[PDB]
Write a protein that binds this ligand. Structure first.
Ligand SMILES: CCCCCCCCCCCCCCCCCC(=O)OC[C@H](COP(=O)([O-])OCC(O)COP(=O)([O-])OC[C@@H](COC(=O)CCCCCCCCCCCCCCCCC)OC(=O)CCCCCCCCCCCCCCCCC)OC(=O)CCCCCCCCCCCCCCCCC
Ligand SMILES: CCCCCCCCCCCCCCCCCC(=O)OC[C@H](COP(=O)([O-])OCC(O)COP(=O)([O-])OC[C@@H](COC(=O)CCCCCCCCCCCCCCCCC)OC(=O)CCCCCCCCCCCCCCCCC)OC(=O)CCCCCCCCCCCCCCCCC
Ligand SMILES: CCCCCCCCCCCCCCCCCC(=O)OC[C@H](COP(=O)([O-])OCC(O)COP(=O)([O-])OC[C@@H](COC(=O)CCCCCCCCCCCCCCCCC)OC(=O)CCCCCCCCCCCCCCCCC)OC(=O)CCCCCCCCCCCCCCCCC
Ligand SMILES: CCCCCCCCCCCCCCCCCC(=O)OC[C@H](COP(=O)(O)OCCN)OC(=O)CCCCCCCCCCCCCCCCC
Ligand SMILES: CCCCCCCCCCCCCCCCCC(=O)OC[C@H](COP(=O)(O)OCCN)OC(=O)CCCCCCCCCCCCCCCCC
Ligand code: HEM
Ligand code: HEM
Lengths: 74, 386, 446, 115, 482, 24
């Protein structure tokens, strides 16, 4: 009849069970794999920086001179 | 706590931005369908920037509009990319707005607290329709000119002041240079009104909170917006970017009409005058019932029904996930809207006109059946009680 | 990067002390104005230095109640030479620990750090005690803190019972409550505090005490700072007349009893016999902490309704208070009072106290005193308090002899003198079930 | 030097400032804004309630006179003490406390919020 | 005519306050000669002299260490065992607590009543407690009762007999015994060292408590109280030769098991996994949370640097006299803004791992700001650290480590703990050299090793609703400024 | 910090050379 939350608070157990339905945890003991995630994010940032740079340059060069006036210069 | 400085987000310079974009609590169970508001905002920003950079090479004159557009395409470095981005992004902006509206319809994101949010959304829809219409008139193509002529001729439907209104809007006795300049000025002006309306939209929603797929009262399980919903919105933005690049770099003119590349000839007329694909449901609603004043009244009734949708009562169960009948009604509505849009791109032959007449009736039957179902299902708990 | 299990190579090692180090005799030097300077040598590599003032809660005029509590709160703060920030930063920089204590008959300012910081410790202590600047904003902040403390002062029942017993029993100097009240907090201010300090922190009533300081160094440091105080005669100690009384606060049930002794710490033999009797009665809240005392063996072991019972005492200059403090069930309160009175009478009656029990209590008192003397802070506190009480530090062997001289006849006589005094009873809790003070006093002789 | 005993220009400046403050019924320290440095705010918080209330009353009277586009009457202007300082010493104490705290590497007690 | 300064009330108040301020603008050098707020390194070699700690190793691996001060009147004798609650199994978790409760209540020569009478009669008293990696039974007595106390200790460790009727009563009293600071720390240990022996709480679950019998206690004693893991620490008025002779005479028939605590730690070691346990109730007036990184072992050379880092993150309390002028920046931030009831940095060291973090008690409204201050200060120690701050932290650490050792019982506790952890008693001079050999560069390096971009473990209980979640703390672990 | 400022200046210069790309 003891509340579940009260029993969980008053009984700190070493064996902790997570959901694990869509995220399979690493076995207890293996080191955290944070370098791999950071490098995946780094590749994504490579991609995002490329897109931002090309968009900015596209807008600037569109506002720049055009082929018609460039050719009329001779 | 205020004695000495803390995290700069809490400072007054960034206090409002923090409260409305970083620390704002949102339900943790929001699906990918909730990123469409931010995606529509991104589409609007893209349209504003691209149009601002197109207006530097566009001349709103009947003798120079088409030539200026072609100059943007050919002579301007990246101008073809600019105009393709603008047109196809207007198309994607309407796509994501339609997805926004239909997700709101499914999850009843309008019912009691977000009535003002829904009304502001309807105003935004009107503003987008007008802005896209004027922008399509801007290139001064054959289809653009004749669509402008026809759609403004709808304004000659008020029995008293219809002719005066249409003549005043035309700037004369026919669509001409005055109409082109008028539409250019309006098409530049409205997107900033659209930005203001979008800001009011976001603020009105932030007054109460975002709805969730369950439709239940979601305040016990909420998370901060930034660390968790900026990444989901980023996934949505990248997927939309892939779609947008696909439709720009490989199928640019598929969504457009080929007749818009013919210079506007007032003497001749295209065999089939059809508006843009995202005005097709409204055009089909117009042409369903045979009349002109009747069609304008039907369009006004459509918008009045959209405005009056949130004000129905006894919709205690919000989400359609717990309403089988309402889910079926919504899916029938979506099929009806797709069929209506398809009909809008067809002639006025017998099967097409019959189906258009039926489709509009189903469209309004949705707006009646929803209050009927709410009132009927208000007494569900007493009947199924166990 | 040498691991902790390996000795560091480049460290020069200080020579070890011999196994038997001569215990440094206490050295007392009286300054010409009357300030007494005392110190003691210790084998511990840290020293504790305190400044004890004879001023206390008794020396409180009706316009300055709560002044001692505020002074304890306003202990080490901004002065006329260094600010509060500078004081705190100096204390942290030398790593020392600083604190203050306020009692009903004396106030102390303890400051302990490493032994090489003696001059700085003495200088900061003397400055912060003799020359305090009671700034209005700091006094207001401390007043707010004391307001919060009073608002959350009901958690501890024991201190409240002691305060109530003192207030009820005494009607003179000791009647002044040690803890401040709401009205006193509302009316006190920096000007009143400064006037109180100037009037009561006079030279004859101020004493230095040290635990690990050589006398020459501390005297040389403290002479330029304490010799400037004027020589003014000490005021006569205010007198309090003990009258049996009753206090009731209806808010389990907590109550206690008390009695009075004609002589306090000046009657050393009687005071030490009272301490032995307190240890004999003992206590417990339900090995070697006193589970074989008379109260534990006769009360806690035969009455589960007795939540917590102990024997308390408080010995001041020329007066003493001794009694039993106990909390129990609300419905058991009358029987609990009857049992406590019966136990007190049984201790009073001759022949009930066993020789083995008295020997155990005597050894427990001796061991408690000897283990208390271990701490350097307790050594300095003992030096200062003994000097304030007598004028000289009585050696520990005198207390040992007084403990060893206690006999059954002596403890019976002391208990008779206890029960011959008027009764003071204070109850806090489910009051309206307790018997009447007339009945409680009739349970005892005059 | 800025002294109205060896400098005629300084004496004239003091006379003009006294005249202006008397006309507006003000005191020089009342010109110090708590929102400006927060040292004035700390000094005013430390100052006695009677002095703070008197400063507020003087400031309200001056604001009312400015709104009404009028000055104090002749007698009230005569019985004015524009340079009877009450905040300069406390302000100097607060400033020197802040300077001492910053020199020893201490976090400021008060910090201005970014507008 | 301007009225005189004494005419009106506020003018009088202004004059009074100005006069009060004018009497402190002029200090005197005689009251500032020696005091100095700027921290400075000092040489304490002339005073860091203590009686030599004599350590003798018996043939069976038993250790006997004494710090003799023959001038003292009292002495303490204790037994420290390097076996605690970590070196047990999942089936027997509360065995250490049950044994430390049952070890004073029965022997084949003295029952509980006789043992308590003997303890009380000589005046001294004996205490005992079990940590997660240590178990101590010590006794403080007068100098004449040292042989009796030693005999009692040997008798209770070896000849103990566990009566079944006493086992039942102790089980009942433990189930009755079933601050919240220890609760928070137990939850933090369970969620940090999960699926490892350090995860289990010291007291143990009720299911394993109920099944404890005499055989289990006897097996635990025989398998863990082995002589090589056993050290008798004596402090005060004792003689090393006499103590060694008494130990040789008494401490016989002790268990001799080949298994060593080093190999027990090597098998199934403790691994720190970043996790959080949140116990929101909102029914408690205050919210208490503890965020902790991974610390260093006892013999790790960076442990002293971790203690220094704790010192420069010193504790602050609402009733503390320091107020808002404390040395550490975290205490200043908390006190100035009053965003917490009480903060305290903790550094716990174990055989192969440890914890280093901050435990804070605060009102529900200030949780976010308090957590921001904590993370800001910790990452500040990671990135930029002040030389004067490091010097003050070192001075405070030295002063605290020497003030805690005040008395025979603290001396004996230090001796036993240092022999169990370091294998030796670190002399005061060497400890001071180790502490003062820590500078800003060392602090930065150790914080980079232990804090920078390292997973945290957060245990929170109370109205924890404004407390930031795990990702917030994980991001705050590092700075993006550089 | 001087080193931090120098590294941030290097990063800003690299970003500028990536954006403008003078002589790649
Ligand atoms: C024979 C009968 C066959 C029946 C098949 C039914 C089926 O497959 O339903 C899938 C799915 C329903 O599955 P569900 O998990 O039960 O419902 C989705 C959850 O409510 C919510 O689940 P969710 O939000 O996690 O996922 C729903 C979906 C949401 O996907 C979208 O929003 C993209 C829609 C593109 C059109 O997300 C994905 O598919 C995952 C990737 C999303 C990437 C981001 C896309 C952002 C927009 C990009 C630009 C689009 C233009 O259908 C839909 O989501 C609707 C499809 C379109 C209807 C019009
Ligand atoms: C300096 C201030 C630093 C700071 O405190 O930042 C706050 C904060 C930094 O937070 P933190 O915790 O200090 O840093 C770690 C975070 O995880 C933040 O770091 P992170 O790893 O999350 O960084 C990710 C970031 C990395 O971004 C970059 O590296 C770019 C620079 O990604 C983005 O900015 C997302 C780009 C999405 C592009 C979507 C394109 C849609 C289609 C457009 C048309 C395509 C046609 C073909 O920065 C952000 O939260 C970044 C928000 C970025 C939002 C971008 C939205 C772009 C919408 C454009 C629409 C109009 C397009 C017109 C053409
Ligand atoms: C307005 C424009 C400016 C906005 C600035 C925002 C950030 C302000 C700030 O101080 O942040 C720091 C702040 C750092 O956290 P904190 O708790 O305040 O401080 C932690 C550490 O104590 C201190 O944090 P920390 O040490 O990691 O550094 C924080 C900050 C501190 O900055 C400084 O100390 C001075 C400035 C940097 C100097 C060194 C370079 O420094 C930086 O951010 C360094 C950036 C270096 C360049 C990176 C390229 O950033 C955040 O908390 C994250 C902000 C994320 C913002 C996301 C906004 C968008 C999310 C929703 C998007 C929805 C869709 C939108 C589009 C819809 C259609 C149109
Ligand atoms: C070039 C410009 C290009 C266009 C830029 C965007 C234009 C947006 C137009 C609408 C802006 C409406 C105002 C938004 C900011 C705001 O509302 O700030 C309110 C805040 C009031 O002060 P505060 O005391 O912080 O109050 C909030 C907490 N009680 O205000 C403040 O604290 C001060 C805010 C100053 C501006 C910060 C950005
Ligand atoms: C151009 C115009 C484009 C208009 C597009 C309109 C899209 C409207 C989306 C409305 C929301 C939606 O469809 O949600 C998914 C829906 C219900 O799913 P839900 O109730 O969230 O979850 C079931 C239990 N997990 O489930 C489904 O949609 C499942 C059926 C999908 C049929 C696809 C054919
Ligand atoms: C103020 C910002 C804007 C400016 C300056 C602008 C300007 C222009 C110009 C000059 C054109 C003709 C050039 C071309 O199409 O190649 C155009 C086309 C168009 N615009 Fe905009 N526009 C803006 C915002 C928008 C927005 C917000 C929408 C969507 C509601 C929109 C919808 C369109 C459409 C549909 C076309 C027709 C594209 C085509 O097929 O040729 N515009 N705009
Ligand atoms: C310019 C186009 C639009 C933009 C930029 C926009 C933007 C947004 C944003 C940012 C949100 C909050 C995030 C979310 O909940 O998805 C939102 C929510 C919402 N919008 Fe829009 N919107 C637009 C058009 C519309 C339209 C036409 C409607 C129809 C009336 C509408 C109705 C709603 C509703 C009902 C919500 C609440 C979502 C929920 O609580 O479930 N929006 N919009």
């Amino acid at each position: 009849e003891i509340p579940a939350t009260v029993a969980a608070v008053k009984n700190p157990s070493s064996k902790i069970i997570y959901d694990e339905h869509n995220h399979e945890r690493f076995p207890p003991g293996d080191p955290s794999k944070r370098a791999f995630a950071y490098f995946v994010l780094t590749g994504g940032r490579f991609v995002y920086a490329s897109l931002i740079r090309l968009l900015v340059l596209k807008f600037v060069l569109s506002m720049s001179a055009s082929k018609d006036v460039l050719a009329l210069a001779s | 706590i205020r004695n000495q400085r803390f995290s700069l987000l809490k400072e007054p310079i960034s206090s409002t931005l923090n409260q409305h974009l970083i620390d704002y609590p949102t339900p943790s169970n929001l699906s990918y369908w909730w990123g469409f508001g931010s995606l529509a905002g991104i589409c609007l920003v893209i349209q504003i920037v691209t149009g601002v950079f197109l207006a530097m090479h566009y001349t709103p004159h009947v003798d120079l509009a088409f030539n200026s557009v072609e100059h943007v395409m050919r002579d301007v470095e990246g101008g073809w990319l600019l105009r393709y981005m603008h047109a196809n992004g207007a198309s994607m902006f309407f796509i994501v707005v339609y997805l926004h509206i239909f997700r709101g319809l499914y999850y009843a994101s309008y019912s009691s607290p977000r009535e003002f949010v829904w009304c502001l959304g309807v105003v935004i829809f009107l503003l987008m329709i007008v802005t896209a219409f004027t922008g399509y008139v801007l290139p001064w193509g054959q289809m653009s000119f004749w669509g402008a002529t026809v759609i403004t001729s709808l304004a000659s439907a008020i029995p008293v002041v219809g002719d005066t209104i249409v003549t005043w809007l035309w700037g004369g006795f026919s669509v001409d240079n005055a109409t082109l300049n008028r539409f250019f000025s309006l098409h530049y002006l409205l997107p900033f009104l659209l930005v203001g309306a979008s800001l009011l939209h976001l603020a009105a929603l932030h007054q109460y909170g975002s709805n969730n797929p369950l439709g239940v009262h979601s305040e016990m399980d909420q998370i901060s917006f930034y660390p968790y919903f900026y990444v989901k919105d980023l996934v949505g933005w990248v997927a939309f970017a892939i779609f947008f690049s696909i439709w720009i770099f490989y199928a640019p003119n598929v969504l457009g009409h080929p007749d818009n590349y013919i210079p506007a000839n007032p003497m001749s007329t295209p065999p089939h005058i059809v508006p843009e694909w995202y005005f097709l449901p409204i055009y089909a609603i117009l042409r369903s019932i045979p009349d002109k004043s009747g069609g304008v009244a039907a369009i006004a009734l459509v918008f009045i029904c959209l405005l009056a949708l949130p004000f129905f009562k006894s919709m205690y169960v919000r989400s359609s996930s717990f309403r089988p009948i309402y889910q079926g009604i919504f899916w029938l509505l979506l099929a009806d809207c797709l069929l209506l849009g398809w009909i809008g791109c067809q002639p006025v032959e017998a099967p097409f006109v019959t189906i258009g007449q039926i489709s509009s009736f189903v469209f309004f039957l949705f707006f009646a059946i929803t209050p009927i179902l709410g009132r009927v299902g208000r007494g569900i708990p007493n009947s199924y009680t166990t | 990067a040498t691991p902790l299990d390996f000795p560091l190579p480049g460290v020069i090692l200080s020579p070890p002390l011999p196994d038997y180090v001569a215990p440094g005799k206490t050295i007392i030097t009286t300054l010409p104005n009357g300030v007494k300077v005392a110190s003691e040598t210790s084998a511990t590599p840290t020293a504790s230095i305190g400044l004890y003032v004879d001023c206390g809660s008794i020396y409180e005029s009706p316009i300055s109640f709560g002044a001692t509590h505020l002074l304890e709160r306003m202990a080490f703060k901004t002065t006329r030479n260094r600010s509060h920030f500078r004081v705190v930063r100096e204390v942290e920089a030398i790593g020392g620990n600083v604190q203050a204590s306020a009692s009903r008959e004396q106030m102390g300012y303890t400051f302990d750090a490493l032994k090489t910081y003696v001059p700085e410790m003495v200088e900061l202590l003397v400055d912060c005690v003799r020359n305090p600047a009671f700034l209005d904003w700091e006094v207001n902040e401390q007043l707010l803190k004391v307001k919060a403390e009073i608002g959350e002062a009901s958690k501890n029942p024991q201190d409240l019972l002691l305060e109530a017993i003192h207030s009820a029993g005494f009607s003179g100097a000791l009647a002044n409550p040690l803890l401040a009240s709401e009205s006193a907090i509302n009316r006190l201010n920096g000007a009143i505090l400064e006037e109180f300090v100037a009037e009561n922190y006079t030279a004859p009533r101020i004493v230095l005490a040290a635990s690990g300081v050589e006398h020459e160094e501390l005297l040389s440091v403290a002479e330029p700072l304490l010799s400037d105080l004027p020589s003014v005669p000490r005021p006569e100690e205010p007198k309090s007349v003990y009258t049996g009384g009753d206090y009731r606060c209806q808010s389990r049930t907590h109550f206690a009893l008390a009695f009075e002794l004609p002589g306090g710490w000046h009657k050393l033999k009687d005071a030490m016999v009272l301490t032995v009797l307190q240890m004999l009665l003992g206590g417990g809240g339900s090995p070697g902490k006193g589970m074989y005392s008379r109260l534990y063996l006769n009360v806690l072991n035969q009455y589960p309704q007795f939540h917590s019972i102990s024997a308390f005492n408080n010995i001041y200059n020329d007066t003493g208070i001794f009694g039993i403090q106990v909390t129990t069930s609300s419905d058991f309160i009358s029987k609990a009072i009857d049992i406590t009175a019966n136990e007190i009478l049984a201790v009073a009656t001759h022949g009930k106290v066993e020789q083995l029990q008295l020997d155990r209590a005597k050894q427990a008192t001796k061991s408690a005193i000897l283990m208390n003397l271990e701490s350097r802070m307790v050594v300095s506190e003992d030096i200062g308090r003994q000097i304030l009480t007598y004028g000289e530090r009585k050696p520990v062997e005198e207390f040992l002899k007084a403990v060893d001289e206690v006999t059954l006849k002596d403890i019976s006589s002391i208990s008779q003198k206890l029960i011959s005094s008027p009764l003071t009873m204070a109850s806090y809790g489910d009051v309206l079930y307790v018997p009447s003070y007339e009945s409680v006093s009739s349970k005892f002789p005059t | 030097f800025l002294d109205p005993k060896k400098n005629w220009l300084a004496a004239q400046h003091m006379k003009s400032l006294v005249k202006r403050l008397s006309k507006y019924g003000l005191r020089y320290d009342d010109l110090y804004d708590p929102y400006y440095d927060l040292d004035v705010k700390e000094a005013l918080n430390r100052l006695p309630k009677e002095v703070v209330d008197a400063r507020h009353a003087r400031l309200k009277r001056a604001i009312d006179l400015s709104m009404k586009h009028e000055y104090l009457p002749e007698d009230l202007q005569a019985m004015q003490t524009p340079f009877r300082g009450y905040l300069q010493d406390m302000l100097a104490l607060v400033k020197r406390e802040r300077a001492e705290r910053e020199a020893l590497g201490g976090l400021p007690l008060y910090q201005r919020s970014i507008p | 005519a301007p009225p005189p300064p004494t005419a009106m009330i506020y003018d009088r108040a202004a004059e009074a306050i100005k006069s009060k301020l004018r009497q402190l603008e002029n200090p005197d050098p005689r009251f500032l000669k020696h005091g100095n707020p700027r921290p400075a390194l000092s040489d304490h070699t002339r005073i860091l002299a203590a009686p030599e700690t004599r350590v003798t190793t018996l043939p069976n691996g038993l250790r006997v260490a004494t710090e003799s001060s023959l001038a003292a009147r009292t002495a303490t004798v204790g037994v420290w065992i390097d076996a605690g609650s970590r070196f047990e199994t999942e089936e027997t978790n509360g065995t250490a607590h049950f044994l430390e409760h049952m070890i004073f209540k029965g022997t084949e020569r003295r029952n509980a009543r006789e043992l308590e009478e003997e303890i009380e009669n000589m005046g001294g008293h004996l205490n005992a407690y079990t940590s997660r990696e240590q178990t101590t039974y010590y006794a403080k007595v007068t100098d004449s009762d040292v042989p009796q106390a030693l005999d009692i200790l040997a008798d209770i460790l070896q000849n103990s007999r566990f009566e079944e009727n006493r086992i039942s009563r102790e089980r009942d009293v433990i189930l009755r015994e079933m601050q919240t600071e220890e609760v928070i720390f137990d939850h933090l240990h369970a969620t940090a060292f999960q699926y490892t022996p350090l995860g289990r709480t010291i007291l143990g679950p009720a299911q394993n408590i109920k099944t404890i019998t005499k055989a289990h206690l006897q097996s635990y004693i025989q398998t863990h109280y082995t002589a090589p893991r056993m050290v008798i620490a004596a402090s005060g008025a004792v003689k090393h030769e006499d103590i060694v002779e008494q130990v040789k005479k008494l401490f016989t028939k002790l268990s001799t098991d080949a298994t060593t605590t080093a190999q027990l730690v090597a098998k199934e070691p403790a691994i720190f996994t970043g996790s959080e346990v949140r116990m929101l109730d909102d029914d408690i007036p205050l919210a208490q949370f503890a965020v902790a990184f991974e610390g260093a072992s006892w013999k790790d050379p960076d442990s002293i640097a971790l203690m220094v880092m704790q010192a420069m993150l010193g504790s602050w309390n609402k009733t503390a006299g320091g107020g808002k002028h404390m040395g550490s920046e975290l205490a200043q931030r908390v006190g100035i803004n009053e965003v917490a009831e009480s903060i305290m940095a903790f550094n716990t060291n174990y055989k192969d791992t440890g914890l280093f973090g901050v435990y804070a008690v605060a009102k529900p409204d200030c949780l976010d700001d308090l957590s921001y201050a904590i993370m800001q200060e910790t990452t500040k120690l990671v990135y930029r650290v002040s030389e004067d701050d490091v010097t003050r932290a070192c001075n405070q650490l030295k002063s605290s480590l020497l003030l805690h050792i005040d008395g025979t019982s603290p001396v004996a506790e230090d001796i036993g703990r240092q022999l169990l952890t370091y294998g030796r008693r670190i002399p005061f001079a060497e400890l001071f050299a180790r502490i003062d050999a820590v500078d800003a560069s060392t602090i930065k390096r150790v914080a980079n090793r232990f804090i920078y971009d390292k997973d945290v473990a957060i245990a929170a209980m109370g109205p924890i609703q404004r407390l930031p979640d795990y990702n917030w703390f994980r991001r705050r672990t590092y700075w993006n400024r550089y | 910090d001087v080193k931090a400022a120098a590294m941030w200046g290097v990063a800003a210069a690299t970003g500028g050379l990536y954006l403008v790309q003078v002589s790649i």
